[PDB]
Design a protein around this ligand. Structure first.
Ligand SMILES: NC(=O)c1ccc[n+]([C@@H]2O[C@H](COP(=O)([O-])OP(=O)(O)OC[C@H]3O[C@@H](n4cnc5c(N)ncnc54)[C@H](O)[C@@H]3O)[C@@H](O)[C@H]2O)c1
Ligand SMILES: NC(=O)c1ccc[n+]([C@@H]2O[C@H](COP(=O)([O-])OP(=O)(O)OC[C@H]3O[C@@H](n4cnc5c(N)ncnc54)[C@H](O)[C@@H]3O)[C@@H](O)[C@H]2O)c1
Ligand code: NA
Ligand code: NA
Lengths: 500, 500
């Protein structure tokens, strides 16, 4: 059932030069279920060269210098193909990364949705070219051209395998770039299947190249390659640093989407079951593996007790099972390494004097797989590890407040600044807290809903630059100023040689 | 004559903590003519804290959360002061960095012009807040807020002391940020005078801090400070690499405007005198110390002999003297170190078999000061140092071509990609060569003219990001997405606890 593939390079399948391969593990069962190719520098070198050629081939006429509407057709066709293979792609996603099937299906709709969104942006791009710049002199004219930034390396995480890749691939292709996508080794199946869809769409060879493998072996050489114009990255802050470090040696532009410790602030004037559902979605959905997870509950003390009672009840209704099982609302975490790391976060918080209100370990009824109960940790102190560090599992901590000012202070109490959410019936209070949040994304009376139309990214230690929306496309376009002297007069700055 | 000043921190003059100072040298005379304060980490610490406080003070009401029209008035008032003090400021610039007085007067006009431009942009910004994002669902509403990015470190070079400072300071202040400016230790006089102008205008304390000193002592701590939100930099690629390297540790956003080896392509179908003047302006103007200098001449063989003859005639008419002298069209280079570096490029070019068509050493009639004659180097081969490395002095090297395609390949034969220029009466040929240039900035039928209204920055090894125009303002604004659930229906993703 699980496909066996090569690297996708220059329009076709291709064995890694050193022919190495790595396991595919199903997090729900812990069994090895196949393998994926493991790329090295010599594969990067081939892929990058293929990308270069794809940009220059035929004067760039098939891709780079073609009109946006031409690229748009390719992106619409990729979108229709994804929609066609939805049932299979969603199942491979759930198998590969462990998210509930109903989540994977949502992801696959949004992959198609993203390609279509950027296809429409590609059609609008042609009219955006040669944008006049108004000048305070009639002796010059100036305009702007928007050109493909060039060869791009795209390095993505496993929590939303196909979708994270798409967020980068769609605008990059829409802008006329040629991409090397390096998906997470923990979940590469659906990205490899993106290769097949490229073949079936007839996407020009070298325009998209997919290289699976270990981060240091296959990701790292993208950031140190003379012919890579930009690296776009989503994942850990630590890996971000390393990639940014390496790129510096060649002053290569890098964009970083990183993790966070996002706050959800819940005021007293709310429907408790609505606010309880959003809090669970904010921390436990995607099996807690959300970069922008509201993993810190900032809860008005007047309702603390009854909110926590309600939220625990909701947790008890969450069906935790194999992701493919009907009605699944929580799957296993992606891997053994993470499973053990998450539980260590829970025990450390126990060792520091915090209370496990609910959850804390694997569920009793599941013997195999990396399953963890939705955990709520209470009696939490500002200096505890649980409060400051990203857990990336179904683990929420709770602190209480009374004043709006104290809630904001607790909210902004972190080195990160990706997401933030406020829930209150008082809308002027929502706006006030919105403005006070030091985050790139703020949700009002919800937590987590993510639209392709709107800009996505962090402040402080959560990285920089925005993806999605028009920002997403602009990340892959280089701006060229064209300024023209239209006066027939000599510049007249230097003294001319006398005539005779 | 030459003012004596302290650091400018938190609205007032303040001695370095370790009270060190460093000399000011007149490049024209080589005399020590005064001194400037030399900041260290502990001064950066004080300046950074001062910037922080400045953003939060009175709930940001004076500056950060104030309307754009309020910051505009401060910017217009700075612009008026610069204009008022033009004669003294221009003279200070010339004495400090060595550029002809007529050039410094032009810089000071544009300093004022830049503040005025960004004042207009600060006003327009109020109307750009809360821009709605159009959603494919009636159950959510979304918009964007544009907030100050926060505490910015601004690190600038000596070739346009006040103007380069302004390119960063004006948009940063227009965006409601608070800035720490670290000017070049080779030319800090006019930037310190910006300090006095801030006092006189009543700019809120901490909004602009001016820290003079050594690169590693005063600039470097900006890139490693947890409270610095962004570093904006213009200077050498090597220093750029270092700043980007340090900033990566805290995953801090950095923008780099670096040097290049920019080409000028001159086709046979042109007025030789006009083309000659522009080639001189492109390489020898500002004493050849232009990041975007067209330091490689790509000249059509059919006109090569007679073009080179004309350009030599024009060069002989360039008056080279003390920058304050009436009619000066070439001053000394900024420093001894630069002086010696440039002469080494000329002799290394001779050591490799290239010809020195004109210039090559100091002028005979000037016994003191770091003067170098405008230099044309011919018989150049692509592997020569002179062809590939940035000289940053009045040194032009020449190569010949016959076909448009050969000229483009020569033009793009470089790791850099800041600027580029085409001169031809055939405007359709200009457009073709424009599109083909791998550069951020292209000049048609001229070389070098620079407008505040138009985006400025490089591709490849010349850095990333764009300054000036609306791009300049956006560099200092963080994007905040605000997405609000407006449905009264429950999210309905999770199974609710049974009603009893
Ligand atoms: O959590 P998580 O593990 O997904 O986040 P992570 O940051 O470890 O991984 C995110 C992505 O970056 C890649 N990566 C890992 N180490 C790398 C390195 N040294 N250089 C370049 N790329 C690298 C990974 O393979 C993955 O595709
Ligand atoms: O002028 P130029 O040709 O010397 O260009 P440069 O790049 O060395 O200088 C440009 C600016 O960067 C600063 N700088 C130099 N070294 C630095 C370092 N290690 N860390 C931070 N900032 C530094 C300089 O003081 C100057 O203001
Ligand atoms: Na897997
Ligand atoms: Na000086």
């Amino acid at each position: 059932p699980i496909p066996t593939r090569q690297l996708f390079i220059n329009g076709d399948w291709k064995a890694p030069v050193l022919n190495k391969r790595i396991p595919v593990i199903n997090p729900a069962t812990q069994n090895i279920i196949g393998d994926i190719p493991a790329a090295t520098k010599e594969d990067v070198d081939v892929a990058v060269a293929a990308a270069k050629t794809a940009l220059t081939r035929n004067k760039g006429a098939d891709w780079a210098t073609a009109s946006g509407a031409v690229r748009a057709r390719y992106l619409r066709a990729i979108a229709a193909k994804v929609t066609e293979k939805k049932p299979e792609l969603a199942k491979l996603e759930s198998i590969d990364c462990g998210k509930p099937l109903d989540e994977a299906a949502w992801d696959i709709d949004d992959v198609a949705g993203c390609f279509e969104y950027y296809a429409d942006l590609a059609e609008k791009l042609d009219a955006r070219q040669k944008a006049p710049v108004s000048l305070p002199m009639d002796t010059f004219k100036s305009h702007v051209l928007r050109e493909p930034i060039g060869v791009v390396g795209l390095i993505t995480p496993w929590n939303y395998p196909m979708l994270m890749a798409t967020w980068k691939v769609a605008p990059a292709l829409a802008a006329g770039c040629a991409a090397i996508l390096k998906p997470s080794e923990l979940a590469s199946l659906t990205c490899l299947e993106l290769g097949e869809i490229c073949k079936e769409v007839g996407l020009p060879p070298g325009v998209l190249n997919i290289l699976t493998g270990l981060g240091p072996e296959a990701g790292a050489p993208l950031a140190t390659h003379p012919d890579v114009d930009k690296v776009a990255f989503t994942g850990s802050s630590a890996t971000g640093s390393k990639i940014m470090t390496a790129a510096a040696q060649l002053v290569k532009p890098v964009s970083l989407e990183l993790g966070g410790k996002s706050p959800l602030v819940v005021f007293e004037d709310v429907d408790l079951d609505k606010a309880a559902e959003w809090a669970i979605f904010g921390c436990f959905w995607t099996n807690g593996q959300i970069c922008s997870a509201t993993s810190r509950l900032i809860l008005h003390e007047s309702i603390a007790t009854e909110f926590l009672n309600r939220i625990v009840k909701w947790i008890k209704n969450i069906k935790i099972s194999d992701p493919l099982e009907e009605g699944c609302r929580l799957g296993p975490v992606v891997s053994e390494g993470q499973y053990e790391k998450i539980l260590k976060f829970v025990s450390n918080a126990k060792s520091e004097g915090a209370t496990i209100l609910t959850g804390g370990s694997r569920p009793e009824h599941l013997k195999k797989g990396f399953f963890i109960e939705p955990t709520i940790i209470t009696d939490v102190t500002t200096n505890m590890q649980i409060w400051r560090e990203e857990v990336f599992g179904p683990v929420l901590c709770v602190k209480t407040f009374s004043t709006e000012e104290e809630a904001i202070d607790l909210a902004n109490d972190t080195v990160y600044g990706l997401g933030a959410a406020v829930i209150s019936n008082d809308l002027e209070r929502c706006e006030r807290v919105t403005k006070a949040f030091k985050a790139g994304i703020v949700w009002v009376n919800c937590s987590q809903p993510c639209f392709t139309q709107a800009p996505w990214g962090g402040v402080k230690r959560s990285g920089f630059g925005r993806e999605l929306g028009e920002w997403g496309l602009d990340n892959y376009l280089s701006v060229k100023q064209v300024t023209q002297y239209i006066s027939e007069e000599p510049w007249g700055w230097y003294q001319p040689p006398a005539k005779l």
